[PDB]
Amino acid sequence: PHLGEGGALTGTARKAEEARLRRAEIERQTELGRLQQQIEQRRRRARAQIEA
Amino acid sequence: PHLGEGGALTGTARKAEEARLRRAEIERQTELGRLQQQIEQRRRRARAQIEA
Numbered sequence: 001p002h003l004g005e006g007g008a009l010t011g012t013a014r015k016a017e018e019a020r021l022r023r024a025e026i027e028r029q030t031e032l033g034r035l036q037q038q039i040e041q042r043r044r045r046a047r048a049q050i051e052a
Numbered sequence: 053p054h055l056g057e058g059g060a061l062t063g064t065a066r067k068a069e070e071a072r073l074r075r076a077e078i079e080r081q082t083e084l085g086r087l088q089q090q091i092e093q094r095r096r097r098a099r100a101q102i103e104a
Binding site: 051052 | 100
């Protein structure tokens with residue numbers, strides 16, 4: 001059976017939407033990764049200054 | 053014999069001048085020490101910034 005918020009897709013359109021969903025998930029994961037890395041670089045900064 | 057740039061001091065004045073010379077030598081040594089320490093702190097600074 002077809003599981004998606006839109007639903008009601010058959011044949012090739014189903015595979016296309018699966019690919020689109022995977023792409024969106026990868027995009028969101030990369031966004032969260034960059035945010036994590038930015039806040040951690042701020043932390044490392046605070047470190048270097050404390051050491052000095 | 054009496055050795056000093058002024059010379060011609062006897063008795064107690066001789067000891068007083070010996071003490072004064074020792075004091076001046078200590079003063080100059082402390083001056084050189086502080087200068088050395090200041091330039092080395094600048095060096096350590098340059099380090100910390102390079103590491104960052």
